[PDB]
RNA sequence: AAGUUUGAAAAGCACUUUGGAAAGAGAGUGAAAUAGAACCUGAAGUCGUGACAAAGACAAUGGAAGUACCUCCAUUUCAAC
RNA sequence: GAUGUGGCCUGGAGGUUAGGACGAAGCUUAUGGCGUGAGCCUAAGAUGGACCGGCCUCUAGUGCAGAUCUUGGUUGGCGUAGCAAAGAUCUAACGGAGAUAUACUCAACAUGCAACGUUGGAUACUGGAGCGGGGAAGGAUUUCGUGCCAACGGCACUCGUA
RNA sequence: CCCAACUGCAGACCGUACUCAUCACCGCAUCAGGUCCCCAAGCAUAGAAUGCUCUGGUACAUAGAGAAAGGUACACUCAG
RNA sequence: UUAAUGAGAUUCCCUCUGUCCCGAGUUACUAUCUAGCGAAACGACAGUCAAGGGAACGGACUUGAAGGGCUAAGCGGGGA
RNA sequence: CACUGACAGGGAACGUGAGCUGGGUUUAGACCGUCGUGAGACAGGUUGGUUUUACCCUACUUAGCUGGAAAUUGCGAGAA
RNA sequence: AACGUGUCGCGAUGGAUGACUUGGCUUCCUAUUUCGUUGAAGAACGCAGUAAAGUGCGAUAAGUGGUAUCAAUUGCAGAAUCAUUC
């Protein structure tokens, strides 16, 4: 019946890890990610979840290049004589 | 520390144990029965409780425990033989005897004058009940402190 | 002293189950010295494991 | 969910003794270990212990008047004052 | 239900006047005194260790017994209900701190019980649609050796997928 | 340059432990539930029924003592 | 209307029986005692009755009658 | 219908469901008649349809310990 | 008697209160202030003598170079010099 016994009938996976976000939201069968919409070029972004936007926005990661370019802009692209 | 101090400090020996991992209710009755006893006769009683020829009287935490004829010597009807609490209390008495011997006292003249069992901090486990319920499975350790004085 | 490891190795070397492996009740301190299949094979040859 | 808020400083309890150990008993540091490491202060509730008060069964609590006993409480008085 | 109160209390601000290492706040009370009361004040701490009181005015997230109120902790029930499907273990030796553990008296019983792991014997079960031997899915080091027993394996462990 | 029999040299990448369940997966858990495939002995017997047994595996599922009432049972019997 | 079929609804007969007259005896596992472990529900405060009034069915109130204290195993009258 | 001396009438929350049972009544499934355009309706008929919890306090039944006449005290002194 | 009750002294359990505050919230201002195919944001692996997380960094990996600055870093260890610099 539904409940405990049917819990043992659940086999396989609907989602695996996504190449773009690594969130385990990549629909194996449909071949698209539920979290970032990969392989669509643009990501998922909805204003009905501002909390979800703040989890993935700029500054929540490393900003490896943005840190460098911000310093260059703040110093007006200083170069040696 | 100890809730009471001995009359003569130099003629006394103290022993303590914290978080015993013996049932507080069982150790409460096992330790209280030897409160006014000479040390040697208290140690004899614990040996006979292990031999099941005498019992520990359960005076407070005795809700629906069995009845035995060995509780009559204590003026009660209900008693038990808590072997786990007896061996721990046997170890505590041995420590107290060692403290007395190191101080130059005679353990054969030592009389227990203070026994105090207190509930320690509990440890948490869980048990699984019907309809997917999770319910506490607490363990209740005890603190035991005592001292004995020369007679 | 536990001879679980030697019994496991002896059972594999002899190609039989645990019930058919006999370890000498005496001479247990030299059986427990055999930590390898080479040393267990010597116990079998010496008759300490049958 | 979670302040690592010990102490001014780790000076974080050498060493002796019992214990398989955890620990206890001593001894030391420190102004203070009841400041001993999730360590300032440490409430309420609940519990243990010693001492005492007694108390039938009127569930207990409560009100008003007394009394017995206690009182680490307050004030007054102590010479014809 | 309305209103009044040089009526009480709390966190901050502008003033004023004080206190504190000879001990501030907080906390404790058979500590008494004052007030009809909200409360205020003193005493003691065998409490604490650094801030804080009075008065005038200003200000506000300003007073709790209950909302099947929220969060944390505690609690009687209570050593109680129970820990009863899958038949089952016994014995000696070894190992282990886990013993044959003792004031007097006392030959041993009647005063150290109960429990562990391994090996050899004994007995039994699974009974090839197996508590057999290999794989997929799922899990991801649970595998192996040594060591170890604080927590965990709802009893236990010296054992362990700890 | 192309065939035959040799011969010489080189054969790159990832997976590989363990488990697959009355403890390793899902069911909050070492949960009497659930979960695909292969190999499958002897005797009785029509036999993959059922019962017992060699091999392999196991003695792990809290135990001891032990005739109250009343219970539960994949336990029985009962005159007329 | 209908042969065959049906874990479908109904009536009767044979057989059979503890369904009953009318209960009795036995077994395993419990309950029960012990060692270890150890909850929950529920919990204003509590808990002997009769009558009376009363929100018209009181554990508390009135007037009577009981009631020494503490306990183990049960039990289902009340605790609307 | 039958026996009998007789087969009286009633109350106790129309006594009594943590005592049972669940046939009826009164969910969801389904059939018929009547009604309704219809969804549906019918104190009309029919068939199928989870009955949970006591370990607390009293009450009751048995089963233990145990003080107390100033009903624990006063020394407060009463003899069927 | 025993359970049980009450009070006081002392303990335990339990972490409220006060003091503390490198945090939050709110308001205001100053700019040669606005990323990416010259590969961004995000995601994943790795890097220390010792290093799980976090931080920093990218096989030149808890960092290379250059300017200043002037003797450390620090749990332990290691380290030419005790330092104009290299
Ligand atoms: K007034
Ligand atoms: K709560
Ligand atoms: K009908
Ligand atoms: Mg399916
Ligand atoms: Mg199926
Ligand atoms: Mg699909
Ligand atoms: Mg596909
Ligand atoms: Mg019982
Ligand atoms: Mg009992
Ligand atoms: Mg359960
Ligand atoms: Mg479940
Ligand atoms: Mg000093
Ligand atoms: Mg202090
Ligand atoms: Mg302090
Ligand atoms: Mg403290
Ligand atoms: Mg308290
Ligand atoms: Mg007290
Ligand atoms: Mg009253
Ligand atoms: Mg009075
Ligand atoms: Mg405020
Ligand atoms: Mg001021
Ligand atoms: Mg006081
Ligand atoms: Mg008081
Ligand atoms: Mg004030
Ligand atoms: Mg408010
Ligand atoms: Mg409050
Ligand atoms: Mg409520
Ligand atoms: Mg309790
Ligand atoms: Mg029980
Ligand atoms: Mg059961
Ligand atoms: Mg079984
Ligand atoms: Mg054996
Ligand atoms: Mg003996
Ligand atoms: Mg023994
Ligand atoms: Mg068999
Ligand atoms: Mg069988
Ligand atoms: Mg076969
Ligand atoms: Mg199999
Ligand atoms: Mg292993
Ligand atoms: Mg266990
Ligand atoms: Mg391989
Ligand atoms: Mg393999
Ligand atoms: Mg398999
Ligand atoms: Mg799982
Ligand atoms: Mg899950
Ligand atoms: Mg079969
Ligand atoms: Mg067969
Ligand atoms: Mg076999
Ligand atoms: Mg199992
Ligand atoms: Mg078994
Ligand atoms: Mg079980
Ligand atoms: Mg029975
Ligand atoms: Mg009545
Ligand atoms: Mg009832
Ligand atoms: Mg019952
Ligand atoms: Mg009725
Ligand atoms: Mg009537
Ligand atoms: Mg019912
Ligand atoms: Mg009925
Ligand atoms: Mg009823
Ligand atoms: Mg019915
Ligand atoms: Mg019609
Ligand atoms: Mg019906
Ligand atoms: Mg119907
Ligand atoms: Mg049916
Ligand atoms: Mg008297
Ligand atoms: Mg790039
Ligand atoms: Na049992
Ligand atoms: Na299972
Ligand atoms: Na049918
Ligand atoms: Na009532
Ligand atoms: Na009355
Ligand atoms: Zn994605």
TrEMBL record, chain A:
<keyword id="KW-0479">Metal-binding</keyword>
<dbReference type="Pfam" id="PF01907">
    <property type="entry name" value="Ribosomal_L37e"/>
</dbReference>
<feature type="binding site">
    <location>
        <position position="21"/>
    </location>
    <ligand>
        <name>Zn(2+)</name>
    </ligand>
</feature>
<keyword id="KW-0694">RNA-binding</keyword>
<keyword id="KW-0862">Zinc</keyword>
<dbReference type="GO" id="GO:0006412">
    <property type="term" value="P:translation"/>
</dbReference>
<dbReference type="InterPro" id="IPR011332">
    <property type="entry name" value="Ribosomal_zn-bd"/>
</dbReference>
<dbReference type="GO" id="GO:0008270">
    <property type="term" value="F:zinc ion binding"/>
</dbReference>
<feature type="binding site">
    <location>
        <position position="33"/>
    </location>
    <ligand>
        <name>Zn(2+)</name>
    </ligand>
</feature>
<feature type="binding site">
    <location>
        <position position="18"/>
    </location>
    <ligand>
        <name>Zn(2+)</name>
    </ligand>
</feature>
<keyword id="KW-0863">Zinc-finger</keyword>
<dbReference type="GO" id="GO:0022625">
    <property type="term" value="C:cytosolic large ribosomal subunit"/>
</dbReference>
<comment type="function">
    <text>Binds to the 23S rRNA.</text>
</comment>
<keyword id="KW-0687">Ribonucleoprotein</keyword>
<dbReference type="GO" id="GO:0003723">
    <property type="term" value="F:RNA binding"/>
</dbReference>
UniProtKB/TrEMBL annotation, chain B:
<dbReference type="GO" id="GO:0022625">
    <property type="term" value="C:cytosolic large ribosomal subunit"/>
</dbReference>
<keyword id="KW-0479">Metal-binding</keyword>
<dbReference type="GO" id="GO:0005737">
    <property type="term" value="C:cytoplasm"/>
</dbReference>
<dbReference type="InterPro" id="IPR018260">
    <property type="entry name" value="Ribosomal_uL22_CS"/>
</dbReference>
<dbReference type="Pfam" id="PF00237">
    <property type="entry name" value="Ribosomal_L22"/>
</dbReference>
<dbReference type="GO" id="GO:0003735">
    <property type="term" value="F:structural constituent of ribosome"/>
</dbReference>
<dbReference type="GO" id="GO:0002181">
    <property type="term" value="P:cytoplasmic translation"/>
</dbReference>
<dbReference type="InterPro" id="IPR036394">
    <property type="entry name" value="Ribosomal_uL22_sf"/>
</dbReference>
<comment type="similarity">
    <text>Belongs to the universal ribosomal protein uL22 family.</text>
</comment>
<protein>
    <submittedName>
        <fullName>Putative 60S ribosomal protein L17</fullName>
    </submittedName>
</protein>
<feature type="binding site">
    <location>
        <position position="128"/>
    </location>
    <ligand>
        <name>Mg(2+)</name>
    </ligand>
</feature>
<keyword id="KW-0687">Ribonucleoprotein</keyword>
<dbReference type="InterPro" id="IPR001063">
    <property type="entry name" value="Ribosomal_uL22"/>
</dbReference>
<keyword id="KW-0689">Ribosomal protein</keyword>
<dbReference type="InterPro" id="IPR005721">
    <property type="entry name" value="Ribosomal_uL22_euk/arc"/>
</dbReference>
Automatic annotation (TrEMBL), chain C:
<protein>
    <submittedName>
        <fullName>Putative 60S ribosomal protein L19</fullName>
    </submittedName>
</protein>
<comment type="similarity">
    <text>Belongs to the eukaryotic ribosomal protein eL19 family.</text>
</comment>
